[PDB]
Amino acid sequence: AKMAFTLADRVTEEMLADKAALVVEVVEENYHDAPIVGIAVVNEHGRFFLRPETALADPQFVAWLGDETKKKSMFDSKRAAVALKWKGIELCGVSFDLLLAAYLLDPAQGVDDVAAAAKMKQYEAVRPDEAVYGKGAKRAVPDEPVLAEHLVRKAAAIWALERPFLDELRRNEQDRLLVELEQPLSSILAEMEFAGVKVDTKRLEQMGEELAEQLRTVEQRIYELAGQEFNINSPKQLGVILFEKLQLPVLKKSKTGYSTSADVLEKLAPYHEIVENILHYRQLGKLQSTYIEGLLKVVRPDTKKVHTIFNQALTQTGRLSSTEPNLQNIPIRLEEGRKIRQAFVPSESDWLIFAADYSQIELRVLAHIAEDDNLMEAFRRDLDIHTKTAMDIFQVSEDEVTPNMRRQAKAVNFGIVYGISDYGLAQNLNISRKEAAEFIERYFESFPGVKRYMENIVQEAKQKGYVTTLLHRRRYLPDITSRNFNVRSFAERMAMNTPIQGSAADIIKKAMIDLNARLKEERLQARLLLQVHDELILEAPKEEMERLCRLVPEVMEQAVTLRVPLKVDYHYGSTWYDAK
DNA sequence: GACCATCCCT
DNA sequence: AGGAATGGTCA
């Protein structure tokens, strides 16, 4: 039943071949400064299981890990590389990462281990990690005999599956996408994560003090105005005070009871003073739980740093996501919350944070793919696009655009981006579909090319079964041909949206790779810290700011060539907050 | 341990 | 259109 492997107690010369499938196993979910539990190598000479202590103490092994000339096939190499970075070891030569290769072929399958990736091509000579390691309170590294076998099986799997995966990719015209975009990007992310971002804790802790006092005030009020105490954070308990005791109008039901979202409470404010106090409490509460307490809990005390993990093979569109902490949802919209960014600071002395963002990248991508003339023009003029849209759909001159007319031409614009229907717009603008379709009809009259795109795209999705991005990312939409209207329409929104959202991910991903090449060429010390969807955040010495101001937007703006110009803006300052 | 509902970002 | 983290809940 077993798979044959030498359980090596010493590193021999035949374990160091030029081509190999390697496994450096890090069971911990958060791999930052995480133990490596075992190692397996498979190559032309055999199958080997090496204990970390033995192997990682071996100058010959660690030299093989670092040699770029020695090519290694792997599953989720970033996990491996970071875990080794924390131990002063560099991993190079990884020319094939199956996790990223599975992800490119079909992001829907949710590949998250070798077993899942293996089934894709009908190979099942390997177990689901969860099967070996357990789950949750049961998670545990097993004994050496079981471990070594599993690890060798994974390795064997990778060795087996490379050629078939790489062949399919090529058919799909995604071979370069793997080797030139996603894999090279894997390295940059490794470094970004390892580096981390410094957190001024005292600053954070003080904010935690002020909030604690402010929440204590609002809380008391709420109970006073309620004439009672209850768990304000309970959707069920609160829904009893609002909709039963104070007889507030039920404007919405959730699946399990009445809805107490901000949207509902905003409308109920005129009826009772308790409402404003609840929303105020929720705002200050979110900040306390997620942005002061949640953060201080993941700051490493040793370096006062946070090292996020960037998931590269998770999002359905090609975007990244970051975890523990999520450094892509730090509050910026309201001033109270925006001040949480004062706690993100440069890691050295005399350094500054530097933020470069893309200006309306999505809509610029739409302009390019749809080839809409009116829209291409608007961008060649570097116009305010919301004002411009307000001018066209409402048939007025620049000076006639009122603030609300602009607020709505915005709502629509993102409607178009998301492929939204009258109904989605209706609620979004607070109105009715009878009038929401009038805007839409009116939009497509000023933008015949975008209309033309929505039609062609849904149809190609219908015919081909998938939609593609500029750089060849792919999304299968099996639900497009569904008979259920809800399920059909949603797939159509995806057909419409994914090439836009996903071509934007590709572009910034390419930027990131170009930025790295240049930072190195220019011998600048500036290092890339975060990526927030259309934004790159760096920290550099104060001396380098001036060059970065000219260098970063140019590398970004030049990442690809669309029919409309790309436009970047930048800022910098003592803290992240100030990079505004 | 999963779900839910709520809220934060692009 | 894509994501992630929390407290409550009932299990």
The answer to whether the Cα torsion of A140, A136, A193, A205 is positive or negative is negative
- Candidates 3.50.30.50, 3.30.70.260, 3.30.420.10, 3.40.190.10; CATH matching A1-194: 3.30.420.10
Q: Classify A127 as helix, strand or coil.
A: coil
Distance A328 CA to B10 C1' (A): 8
Q: d(Cα A259, Cα A280) in Å, to the nearest integer?
A: 17
| Beta-carbon contacts of residue A572 (< 8 Å; ≥ 6 apart) | A352, A353, A354, A355, A545, A548, A549, A578, A579
| Beta-carbon contacts of residue A482 (< 8 Å; ≥ 6 apart) | A488, A491
User: What was the structure determination method?
Assistant: X-ray
Give yes or no for CB of A322 within 7 Å of strand C.
yes
Closest CA to A457 of A354, A366, A331: A366
Listed by the residue before each break, gaps in chain A with C–N over 2.5 Å are none
Q: Which residues pair with A357 in a beta bridge?
A: A535, A569
Q: d(Cα A164, Cα A151) in Å, to the nearest integer?
A: 21
Domain ranges within chain A, ordered by starting residue? 1-194, 195-309, 310-360+505-579, 361-504
Task: Give yes or no for a contact between A449 and A375, defined as CB atoms under 8 angstroms apart.
Answer: yes
The answer to whether the Cα torsion of A372, A376, A379, A383 is positive or negative is negative
List the Cα angle A405/A409/A415 in 5-degree steps: 145
**Is it true that the peptide bond before A325 is cis, omega within 30 degrees of 0?**
yes
Most distant CA atoms of chain A, gap in Å: 80
Task: Give yes or no for a contact between A33 and A86, defined as CB atoms under 8 angstroms apart.
Answer: yes
Give yes or no for CB of A310 within 7 Å of strand C.
no
Per CA to C1' distance, which residue is closest to B9? A329
Distance A557 CA to B7 C1' (A): 33
Quote the tokens at residue A62.
């660690």
Fold of the A195-309 domain: Taq DNA Polymerase; Chain T, domain 4 (1.20.1060)
Cα distances (angstroms) measured from residue A530 to each of A168, A512, A538 = 32, 10, 7
Q: Classify A261 as helix, strand or coil.
A: coil
- Residue written as token pair 């996408």: A177
Task: Give yes or no for a contact between A66 and A179, defined as CB atoms under 8 angstroms apart.
Answer: no
Closest CA to A178 of A515, A506, A572: A506
Per CA to C1' distance, which residue is closest to B6? A261
End-to-end CA distance of chain A: 61
Give yes or no for CB of A256 within 7 Å of strand B.
yes
Per CA to C1' distance, which residue is closest to C5? A290
Positions of strand B less than 7 angstroms from a protein CB = 1-2, 4-10
The two counts, helices (H) then strands (E), for chain A are 24, 19
Strands (E), A400-546: 466-468, 474-476, 527-531, 535-541
Indicate the pairing of strand A474-476 with strand A309-311: unpaired
User: What CATH number labels A310-360+505-579?
Assistant: 3.30.70.370
Fold of the A361-504 domain: DNA polymerase; domain 1 (1.10.150)
Q: d(Cα A541, Cα A549) in Å, to the nearest integer?
A: 13
Closest CA to A186 of A88, A276, A85, A255: A85
Closest CA to A309 of A319, A323, A298: A323
